[PDB]
Amino acid sequence: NKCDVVVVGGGISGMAAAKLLHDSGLNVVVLEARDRVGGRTYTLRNQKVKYVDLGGSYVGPTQNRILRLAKELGLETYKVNEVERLIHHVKGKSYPFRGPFPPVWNPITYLDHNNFWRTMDDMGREIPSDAPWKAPLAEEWDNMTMKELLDKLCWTESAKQLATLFVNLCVTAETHEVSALWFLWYVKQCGGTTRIASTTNGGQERKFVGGSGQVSERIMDLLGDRVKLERPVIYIDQTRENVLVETLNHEMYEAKYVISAIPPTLGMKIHFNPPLPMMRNQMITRVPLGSVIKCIVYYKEPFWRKKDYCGTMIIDGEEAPVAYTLDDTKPEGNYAAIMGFILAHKARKLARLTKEERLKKLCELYAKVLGSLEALEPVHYEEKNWCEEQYSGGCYTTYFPPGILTQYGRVLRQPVDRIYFAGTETATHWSGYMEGAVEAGERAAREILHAMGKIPEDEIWQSEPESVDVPAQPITTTFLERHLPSVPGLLRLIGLTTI
Amino acid sequence: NKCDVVVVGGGISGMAAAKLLHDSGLNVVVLEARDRVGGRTYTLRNQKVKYVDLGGSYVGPTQNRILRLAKELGLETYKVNEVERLIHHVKGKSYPFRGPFPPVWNPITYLDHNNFWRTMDDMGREIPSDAPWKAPLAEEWDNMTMKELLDKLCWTESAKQLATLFVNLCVTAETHEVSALWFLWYVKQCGGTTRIASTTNGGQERKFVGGSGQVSERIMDLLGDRVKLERPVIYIDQTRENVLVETLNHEMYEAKYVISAIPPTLGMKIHFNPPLPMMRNQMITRVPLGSVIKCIVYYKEPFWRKKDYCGTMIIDGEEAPVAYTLDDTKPEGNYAAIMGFILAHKARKLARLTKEERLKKLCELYAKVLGSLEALEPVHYEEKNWCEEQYSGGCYTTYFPPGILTQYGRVLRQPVDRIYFAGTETATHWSGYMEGAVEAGERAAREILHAMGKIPEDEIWQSEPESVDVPAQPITTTFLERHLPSVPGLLRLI
Numbered sequence A: 001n002k003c004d005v006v007v008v009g010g011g012i013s014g015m016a017a018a019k020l021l022h023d024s025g026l027n028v029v030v031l032e033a034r035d036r037v038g039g040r041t042y043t044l045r046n047q048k049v050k051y052v053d054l055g056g057s058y059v060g061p062t063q064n065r066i067l068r069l070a071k072e073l074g075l076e077t078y079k080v081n082e083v084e085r086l087i088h089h090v091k092g093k094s095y096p097f098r099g100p101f102p103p104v105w106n107p108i109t110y111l112d113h114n115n116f117w118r119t120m121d122d123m124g125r126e127i128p129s130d131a132p133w134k135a136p137l138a139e140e141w142d143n144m145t146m147k148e149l150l151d152k153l154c155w156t157e158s159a160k161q162l163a164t165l166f167v168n169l170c171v172t173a174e175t176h177e178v179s180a181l182w183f184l185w186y187v188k189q190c191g192g193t194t195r196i197a198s199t200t201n202g203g204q205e206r207k208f209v210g211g212s213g214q215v216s217e218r219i220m221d222l223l224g225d226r227v228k229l230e231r232p233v234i235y236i237d238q239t240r241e242n243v244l245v246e247t248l249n250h251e252m253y254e255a256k257y258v259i260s261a262i263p264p265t266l267g268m269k270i271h272f273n274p275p276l277p278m279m280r281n282q283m284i285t286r287v288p289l290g291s292v293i294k295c296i297v298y299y300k301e302p303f304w305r306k307k308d309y310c311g312t313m314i315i316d317g318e319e320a321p322v323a324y325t326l327d328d329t330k331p332e333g334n335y336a337a338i339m340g341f342i343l344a345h346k347a348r349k350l351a352r353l354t355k356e357e358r359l360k361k362l363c364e365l366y367a368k369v370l371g372s373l374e375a376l377e378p379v380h381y382e383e384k385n386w387c388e389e390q391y392s393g394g395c396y397t398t399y400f401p402p403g404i405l406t407q408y409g410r411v412l413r414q415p416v417d418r419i420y421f422a423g424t425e426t427a428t429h430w431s432g433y434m435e436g437a438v439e440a441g442e443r444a445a446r447e448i449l450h451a452m453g454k455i456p457e458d459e460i461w462q463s464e465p466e467s468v469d470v471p472a473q474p475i476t477t478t479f480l481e482r483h484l485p486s487v488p489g490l491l492r493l494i495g496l497t498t499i
Numbered sequence B: 001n002k003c004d005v006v007v008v009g010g011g012i013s014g015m016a017a018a019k020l021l022h023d024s025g026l027n028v029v030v031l032e033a034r035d036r037v038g039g040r041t042y043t044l045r046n047q048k049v050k051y052v053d054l055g056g057s058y059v060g061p062t063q064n065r066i067l068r069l070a071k072e073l074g075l076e077t078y079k080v081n082e083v084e085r086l087i088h089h090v091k092g093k094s095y096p097f098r099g100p101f102p103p104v105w106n107p108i109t110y111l112d113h114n115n116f117w118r119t120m121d122d123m124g125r126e127i128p129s130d131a132p133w134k135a136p137l138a139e140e141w142d143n144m145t146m147k148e149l150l151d152k153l154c155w156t157e158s159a160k161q162l163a164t165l166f167v168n169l170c171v172t173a174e175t176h177e178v179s180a181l182w183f184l185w186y187v188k189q190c191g192g193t194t195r196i197a198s199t200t201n202g203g204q205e206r207k208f209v210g211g212s213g214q215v216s217e218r219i220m221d222l223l224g225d226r227v228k229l230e231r232p233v234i235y236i237d238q239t240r241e242n243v244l245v246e247t248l249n250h251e252m253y254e255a256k257y258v259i260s261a262i263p264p265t266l267g268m269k270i271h272f273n274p275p276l277p278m279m280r281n282q283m284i285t286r287v288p289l290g291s292v293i294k295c296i297v298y299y300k301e302p303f304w305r306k307k308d309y310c311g312t313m314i315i316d317g318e319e320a321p322v323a324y325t326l327d328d329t330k331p332e333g334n335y336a337a338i339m340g341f342i343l344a345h346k347a348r349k350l351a352r353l354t355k356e357e358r359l360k361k362l363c364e365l366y367a368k369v370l371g372s373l374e375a376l377e378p379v380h381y382e383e384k385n386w387c388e389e390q391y392s393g394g395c396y397t398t399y400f401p402p403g404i405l406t407q408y409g410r411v412l413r414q415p416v417d418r419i420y421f422a423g424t425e426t427a428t429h430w431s432g433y434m435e436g437a438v439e440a441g442e443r444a445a446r447e448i449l450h451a452m453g454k455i456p457e458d459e460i461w462q463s464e465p466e467s468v469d470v471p472a473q474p475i476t477t478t479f480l481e482r483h484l485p486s487v488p489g490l491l492r493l494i
């Protein structure tokens, strides 16, 4: 019934919000739609897997908030296996390699590829993290899709193909579905193309021992009975002195303030009194989440390491159900596994199959990519299609189709009277990740603390000390990487000696 | 508590479905979220305007279902004023014209404009009304926005700007917001560019005497207390033998079947048990509605008629608040009024202003386009910003961003167990309009009748005899229009 702050959503964002509120002396309640906490993080435990992350999993350098929160809860990280070779599978053949990107040998193609990544970061540096619609060419970049941008930038099909796979993997959407401005913001606010895409030194470096689900669960442990499970929120009424929050099992909660810690578009599941202001009312119908099936295939041994493959595959081509994989072997060396994502339109297309038909297609793909008949011998399989989640809407996160971010972006975290907005989508650094979740949750909690007169305004946004355990190597370039011409820039140099 | 069919939504779609079911002898209940019926139609009455449509208003030849239902309810139409000359205002200057499209004089620009309209209709000829995702090129067209299509087709700035305004007017959305496939289908399923853009012999031919709101109000009168106002549906449970539907103020309704007659995205407001199938779960986050403010400025007389202007203005440019207007004068010649639409991003931009401020910007604009000082002396003003409606989401209708129609279009009208889908979005002819609302309400009502064993399968989709009152004339083209070359085709000929 009565408390200081109702937190809607028990994902990482709402749990981190609740925790900061609770540690500061406020009476908090978390109302969660599902019969579990964790949201888009979910750790399954059974005998056959021990544990496995079926939703968000990876943490890496620069994600300092989630590392600190997890560390304080008693959690530990281990490194994703990248000891052996990565594989870039393109046009029906596998090419082993090491480093941030597969090596390009054709010099034209090398210029084009180098120019593409460079330009992505170049554009991204024009986009303020906390205000992407403030980019000088915001309008122009928002009024085109990533497909149209790739068409302009890539003078080789090779670069276009690789870039398409990058977009699909980063935002589980098609290049034609997303705003170029948004997508360029999304990469920048994660530290750029190298940081977002890498294992060592990047987004995919680590996982938590025991699963990421422990983050939400351990905060629930601390909060005790303050976390109401199976309370989907249906109605928020701010016409009276205290905010009123009603659940689907007709329970009523009364609070000074509310934090909405749910993906933006799921705000539609809530009836508002009085109605949302116009801009938000429309924004939450315009912000879909991606489509992905996260699949884990278990084997007797991590046989791929014996062939000097670490288990990372970048797999191009329409016939390939999975376009990206990682080694998911437990740190102790057992429960050998390959994690792979079925992305965007393929998540849609292949959801029609049975679980056993999807397993079959994945083993056959891995057999071919790894040149290994053993991949045909799985011992177990787990999978999650995030598109069927009523209380997620998809994964990993919310994407912005063209024209949306500049028109409606401003309102994503604008308070509505006594409702404040958390959820990874409102973050300025690793939005879409567990990291963005902790940032948006703690920031929304702090907005309410300033509203109550408990902290000055300059404590609303707070920077984070760098993890001592997972430190960040800078993202550096080389001279030639910086100054090699693009393909048309070389065509321009050729025109000039010929004139 | 118990009945045969709960209909969610009392807009024209939900009312038309409930009326057909009740006329078959079924027990229906209509659950309506607002304190009023009509949805995206809304007729306001006061002494100053007598009555004024603030939502959907216009009807025309080929829209035989809405015309039929309205006739049966005792409603009559009158013709929108198109006697005098239309106006095209471009780079600060009015060009009066007669006929549907503004004439173009420069020969290249001419080839470019001609080609643009003709190409939109030839592309439409390959798009099935009932399944646009089966167009030969569905993926290719769905994977680009109308902006991109326009960058490709239009060789002149003139064509591109008129085409842009055309898109903004038809679907209240920017050219870069919307799928080319979806837009091309939207136009095709209204009978083509001419039919959709025309007043005489097109979609803006007519208004209802007394307001379109009467369509839903008069069906509510038939149904009496079967319609439950201020009952927003929150929860639908299909786990048991009877379907259970719960509303916000805790009422429970139990039925054999449900018709959802709300815009697709508004399905998000309802919690479902069991969850929706995946494709629907995701679809209904992918389909926003457009942005529009409908503004009606009142004047002492239809002074524009005196200068041989009919009141229709097509007004180019970023600076103009309103890009399109029609004469809103009552048939009697009184309550002189200009109706204009503030479209898409302008509706977002200009909503921050006060009502008086918007009035003043509209009057200065109309004074300039009509070239009349009398436009600066309004006697009254009414307006409606549909962007702000929790239970509409915008207007006129739902648009599809790039990639969505090919990927999720099929689910739009697919039954989910015992829930059938109505609403103008699920129509195959004049979807987006009151006409589609009717088609969709009746079809979804007839799917249930067939599920109950009351009618054969071939009676679910029914053709509609042409209205005697509003007969359609054929859309024609000329030899030159069919065969003049495009700009690049005139280049390939040089």
Ligand SMILES: *Cc1cc2c(cc1C)N[C@]1([C@@H](CC=O)c3ccccc3)C(=O)NC(=O)N=C1N2C[C@H](O)[C@H](O)[C@H](O)COP(=O)(O)OP(=O)(O)OC[C@H]1O[C@@H](n2cnc3c(N)ncnc32)[C@H](O)[C@@H]1O
Pocket: A008, A009, A010, A011, A012, A013, A014, A031, A032, A033, A034, A036, A037, A038, A039, A040, A041, A054, A055, A056, A057, A058, A059, A169, A170, A171, A203, A204, A231, A232, A233, A234, A261, A262, A263, A266, A269, A270, A292, A294, A386, A391, A392, A394, A395, A396, A397, A422, A423, A424, A425, A432, A433, A434, A435, A437
């Ligand atoms: C789904 C998913 C998510 C992520 C990954 C994979 C999958 C399959 N991968 C991640 C990413 C992110 C990439 O951009 C990644 C992918 C590939 C390579 C590297 C990294 C990770 O590996 N690492 C990572 O940091 N993040 C990953 N993904 C995203 C995270 O899972 C996600 O950002 C956070 O989980 C989001 O947290 P939060 O903002 O708190 O939001 P939730 O959706 O988790 O919580 C909402 C909460 O609200 C409840 N709810 C909904 N509606 C309600 C009503 N009406 N009333 C009451 N409660 C309500 C929900 O049940 C939920 O509990």
Ligand SMILES: *[C]C1=C([C])[C]=C2N=[C@]3([C]([C][C]=O)C4=[C][C]=[C][C]=[C]4)C(=O)[N]C(=O)N=C3N([C][C]([O])[C]([O])[C]([O])[C]OP([O])(=O)OP([O])(=O)O[C][C]3O[C](N4[C]=NC5=C4N=[C]N=C5[N])[C]([O])[C]3[O])C2=[C]1
Pocket: B008, B009, B010, B011, B012, B013, B014, B031, B032, B033, B034, B036, B037, B038, B039, B040, B041, B054, B055, B056, B057, B058, B059, B169, B170, B171, B203, B204, B231, B232, B233, B234, B261, B262, B263, B266, B269, B292, B293, B294, B386, B391, B392, B394, B395, B396, B397, B422, B423, B424, B425, B431, B432, B433, B434, B435, B436, B437
């Ligand atoms: C808004 C609007 C405006 C402003 C305008 C308009 N217009 C029109 C058109 C379109 C096109 O495209 C035009 C324009 C221009 C020129 C010409 C033309 C006209 O005029 N005409 C027609 O026809 N149309 C129109 N529009 C639109 C219309 O209106 C539509 O389509 C219709 O109306 C639709 O309907 P429906 O389908 O039925 O739907 P709605 O109405 O929306 O309804 C629904 C209902 O529901 C409810 N809800 C929600 N939710 C819920 C509910 N209930 C219960 N529960 C729940 N939860 C709501 O409230 C309603 O009522 C136009 C427009």
Ligand SMILES: c1ccc2oc(-c3ncc[nH]3)cc2c1
Pocket: A086, A099, A100, A101, A102, A162, A163, A165, A166, A169, A197, A198, A199, A312, A314
């Ligand atoms: C395009 C698409 C997918 C990709 O995955 C990587 C990667 N994985 C581990 C180090 N780099 C790089 C990359 C580039």
Ligand SMILES: c1ccc2oc(-c3ncc[nH]3)cc2c1
Pocket: B099, B100, B101, B102, B162, B163, B165, B166, B167, B169, B197, B198, B199, B312, B314, B324
């Ligand atoms: C482009 C944009 C808007 C337009 O409105 C018309 C029109 N109105 C009445 C007859 N034709 C034609 C037209 C063309």
